[PDB]
Amino acid sequence: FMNIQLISPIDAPILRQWAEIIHRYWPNPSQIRYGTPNVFGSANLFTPPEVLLLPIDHQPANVTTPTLDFTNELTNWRARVCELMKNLVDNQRYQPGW
Amino acid sequence: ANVWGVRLADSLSSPTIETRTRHYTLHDFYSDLDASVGKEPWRPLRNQRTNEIVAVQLFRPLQGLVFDTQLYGFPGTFSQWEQFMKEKLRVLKYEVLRIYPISTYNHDRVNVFVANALVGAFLSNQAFYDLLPLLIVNDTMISDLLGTGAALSQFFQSHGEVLEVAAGRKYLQMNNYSNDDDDPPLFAKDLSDYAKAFYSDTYEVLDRFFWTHDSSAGVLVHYDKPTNGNHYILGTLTQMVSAPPHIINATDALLLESCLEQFAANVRARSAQPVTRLDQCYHLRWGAQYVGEDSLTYRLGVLSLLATNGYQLARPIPKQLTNRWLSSFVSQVVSDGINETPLWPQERYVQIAYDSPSVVDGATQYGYVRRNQLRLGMRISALQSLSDTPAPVQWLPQYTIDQVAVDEGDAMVSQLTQLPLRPDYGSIWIGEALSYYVDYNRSHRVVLSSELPQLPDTYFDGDEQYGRSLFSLARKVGDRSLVKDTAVLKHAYQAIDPNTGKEYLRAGQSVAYFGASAGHSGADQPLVIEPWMQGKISGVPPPSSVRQFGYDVAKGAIVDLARPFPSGDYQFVYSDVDQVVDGHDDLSISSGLVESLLDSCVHATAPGGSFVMKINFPTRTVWHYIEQKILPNVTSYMLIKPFVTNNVEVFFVAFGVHQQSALTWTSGVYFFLVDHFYRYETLSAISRQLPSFGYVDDGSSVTGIEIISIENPGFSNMTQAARVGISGLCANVGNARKSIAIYESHGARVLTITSRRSPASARRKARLRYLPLIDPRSLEVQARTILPSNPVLFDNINGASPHVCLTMMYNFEVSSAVYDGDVVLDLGTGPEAKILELIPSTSPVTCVDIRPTAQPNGCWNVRTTFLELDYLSDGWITGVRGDIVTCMLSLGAAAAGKSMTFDAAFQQLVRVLTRSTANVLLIQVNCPTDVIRTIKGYLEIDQTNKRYKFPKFGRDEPYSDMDSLERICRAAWPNCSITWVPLSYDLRWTKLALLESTTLSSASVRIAELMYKYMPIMRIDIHG
Amino acid sequence: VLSSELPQLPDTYFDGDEQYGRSLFSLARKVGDRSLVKDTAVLKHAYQAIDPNTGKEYLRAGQSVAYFGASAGHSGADQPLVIEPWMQGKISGVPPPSSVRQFGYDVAKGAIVDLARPFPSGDYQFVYSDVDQVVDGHDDLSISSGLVESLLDSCVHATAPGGSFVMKINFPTRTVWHYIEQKILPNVTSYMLIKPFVTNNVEVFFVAFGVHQQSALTWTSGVYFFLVDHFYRYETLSAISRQLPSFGYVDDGSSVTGIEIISIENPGFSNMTQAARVGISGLCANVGNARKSIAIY
Amino acid sequence: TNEIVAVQLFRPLQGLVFDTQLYGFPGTFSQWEQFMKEKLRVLKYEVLRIYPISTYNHDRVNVFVANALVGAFLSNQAFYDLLPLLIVNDTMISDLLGT
């Protein structure tokens, strides 16, 4: 899993492409700029002051009337997982029974 | 040098002159949005093996590809992709030309950010129309971004005087890219968001922002001429995979790309081409207080600092980069040996050298600081690379004045030994057979049977079989029986018999053949039958009918030839079967088979005809029987021996059978047979010393090859240990030819020193006490890639030249004439005197030449002497004395140099040898002995003006004759005794040619004999 | 004439502006192989006249020559490009040689030898140097002169006397001229100095004739006028190349020389405005009755 | 027919003791040899990552460890524990005894 090259392409295909999906996308870090430093002293120690590390990505409010889009990170992730499972059911050598 | 992997600085260069750049026009926007053939916003990259397009490079009209390629949906082939991009840009082209007229907006500006995000939102279909009217910029560049039209955080967000943008997708991967190392690298520039850029006005405001912003992954700047205003680079945790051993993150990938671009710019700087950016490197700003020493980002920061200073690498970089070379570079940079430069990266400011050729501190103002306290002892000019050749090239050493122990050289060559590997053998002997013939003369002499010398009794030794098998396996032919039969027929049809006045034999003789092998990979008979029937030999008469006999035929019948089977009698029969296969390894049964086979051949000859015998094992009974029986009953005879194999067989030919004649053996036949057995003994003693056919060499034998392998980091003055190693191999090899090779061995540039040892080199190495050492400069200048070759035992393929042959002749007779413990003098020593290799190890020299030599002066066991004094003069032999004079090839050279005749040169030389103290002498004179022959292409003649004019050397000199030489020699010395040496027809000299591992090409040695009878030497004692 | 009378390289030789001009010239100039052109010129001038000793000529066919300093990189035929046509006699003004040996530490077929230090080898009737004094040097006139000393000494001692050689000299100094006048000019029969010109440089091609024969022989005023005019034309063409702009630049109307274009649009066959008329006539006054081309699209 | 029906291999590989189903080689000799070439290229890059050529220019090996290493890499059987036993110690077999 560390080096994707060790997984053989034609002779471990689903493992190879699932590892490729994992290294290609997974949530990225981010930060939000909370708080005030003036009246309140900085309670964090290891980060710089008043910053808040977030394990997924944010983009701020485009508009205040929210409506649906799919061009974001977690619907992206769910779409890739479903693409793998469609490919897995597509490859006939794994299940001959269905 | 070697920072961690070696770099070849030796000087440092930088691009001095600079293009100031132009800015945007909307006319240019339409021009490069129209994808013309001459210019278009993309540019393809291809493989280095298939030249197939696996990646593309795009630039200024589009940068907003930050979204996912699943949302985009591009095809897989480059042609369909580029026409797809063409038609989508055509649609957006029509849209933007609807919303803006060209006439009013002929020369107005734009936001490049709005342009790139516009084409990105159009390709991703993400409602670009709110972004559309913000195209034409206002008074400033960034205030339109701060006061936003519509906040579009999917492309760019504001932060109170600091603009955040997501620059993405400088490159784009095509689906045929498969992480091959020969494929070009990508540097993680094809992912969704490799980094984030912070465009704003001033670095003070940006650092006040970085007080609160995270700086965990490091921050990169450009400091020279930014793309769209002053900014920073914030790489993310996405990593680069395309290097197979190493996994680097985004910031290291960008810094490595930028530093390699600066390394490319530092070589191409030729003080006339202005470039688009003065420097390239990034200079990590705030991460130095986060990450620490011995980290990869820190080490690449060191390399980027040295690159901005203007250093240049060791290996020549490719024009198109590969993952293979990139990973080799990363493996070299994480190696060892931390630093040798006085330079260290900083966070307070950037630093450039006091003697740096860059002028970028005076060019732009902020950030670039000139340092005064740090100085460099290096040079200023550029650097060039040498042109590689695929063939191994020769090298010649030059000796210095220092010396170390030969035991130290032995220790260093034992350290650097790469002896145990199998070499390619080759062939010791090419060409054809040699005409060794003698005829019967009636009135010549008379000898007896018992006087003849024989085979040596040490014939059936395993060592003798070893030597003869070594010779017969090393020797190269077509068909040996073809060569032997052509030689014996060309010598058979020469002379005339005393009975008939015409000749020996005629056309249409209805011949017979004995002992046909009939296996020659086709034409199942001996290979002379068809060309000899057609008359293709062109020295023979063609026969009428040919019958082949023997118990291995294909067309005839198989008959025991030893027991007499009567058949049809033919005018000429030819025996070719041995007595070994029919024999049972005994000289008695060999002689008895000779008896029976010769008896049947005599009784089946159709008398008045002739026959040819071959005899492998002649004995007392054989010679006594043929002298008592055949020699009376024969008219004439012939015995010849062509030579391709080391053996004792001869070819006996009869003439005129069944006529009585008082006829015995003669002393000319005796001298021929003595010299035949003697040359057999000498060449067997030669072949006994040589190693086997398919062996491995390990430096144990006195003759053989030797190679060593060292590696050279850059143009560094390499160590004394490797210098002692190379000079010890030089002392081991003894001024012979040598070839080198320079190539990257498995991640490191290596050096090979390939040559061959010899016993003459062994006596040279034993002659001197200390070994001298060499100049490393002639090895340290080279920077080209000399591709290696397989180790071969024999360098020469076409054969030795006749001039090499005469040099070997002369060296052999000088080495034979010299003895141990003797002062000598060499007149005209040449470039490197072979007299050092000829004489024994304990005898000194007093040698001198007009040519200034580079022999190692001093550190000898027995002393040497090297100087130049224009030897054809006087006064100096009264100073330095000797015992025996060796003047080889310098007589004609000095006579052609001084334009004077051999008579005057020889009388002056014999005058200054009456000044000498030598009792014996031997000099190279140029005297015709036989009637001159005007040898084609080597030696023509001149009757009147008396010159020779060698065309191969392009040299020319007169000749003097032996009676005038005798006149001058007896006018000088009334007591002297002269002995003209005979020509080495016994091949005693051949050991000094074979042990130096060089083939001969026997036409060359025939020309060498025909030439050596035209400049012989003599031996003159002062007494006699 | 005497050695001290000769003019030299200008002391403002190692300027960045001088390197700028010479790199501009050598990059703007168009050739095939410069070494091919130089060697053809030096052989065509080498085989012209006769020596005063022999009545016939300088050299003949089949001289068994040697070569020094082979670059061996010419995109194929890994040797200098005159060896095969000169062996075939394709120059049609030369006699063809018999054997050719190429020396120098960048060869492909010969051996790599330091030519400065004397390594003895086989003596040939004619040798040809082409090794510079820059790569083996270390950017100093003193070490350049010393390499000229050592290389010329080795070339003299490896000449097979009665023959000839050709020298190239990039950096001649007082020591160089004084040394060759005190040493070689006595011991030579005749000589020759030529200069073919494709690059703006101070190098000349010195040719010797009849080595190792003593002769009362010094420099002459015709050689002096040739050398004065050579350094003078170097100075003039360097002053020319110093003013011209660079190779890969962008023009903006700032330099005194360069191009100029403007772009106007013409609606129909209308009598266009006075403003565009002043613009076109101002470009005419800027261009000064030179050639000009237009385009309508 | 002079068609390649069998191959002969030697010293750099001997550890093919497992089953050819588990291996999975193709049927044509050209595809088989390029497959062997690229798998040896991957293991080549791995072993040159873990050992530098400069320090280990002329050091020895266990031939057993080499053959079992290429066999475990072709059979995908967790070769990495076998990996650091490559360069041999003072003797030949004591590294095998003390496993």
Ligand SMILES: C[S@@+](CC[C@H](N)C(=O)[O-])C[C@H]1O[C@@H](n2cnc3c(N)ncnc32)[C@H](O)[C@@H]1O
């Ligand atoms: C080596 S050959 C000559 C072959 C062929 N002439 C050539 O020169 O290439 C001698 C032949 O004589 C045959 N031979 C030996 N003893 C014999 C005998 N007593 N009678 C007949 N043939 C014999 C051997 O079988 C052998 O093939």
Ligand SMILES: C[S@@+](CC[C@H](N)C(=O)[O-])C[C@H]1O[C@@H](n2cnc3c(N)ncnc32)[C@H](O)[C@@H]1O
């Ligand atoms: C640029 S060249 C002349 C090129 C040559 N005319 C040709 O046709 O390729 C000078 C050559 O001499 C070599 N060189 C410089 N100094 C040298 C020395 N002291 N001994 C031997 N070779 C030297 C350089 O490496 C270079 O290859």
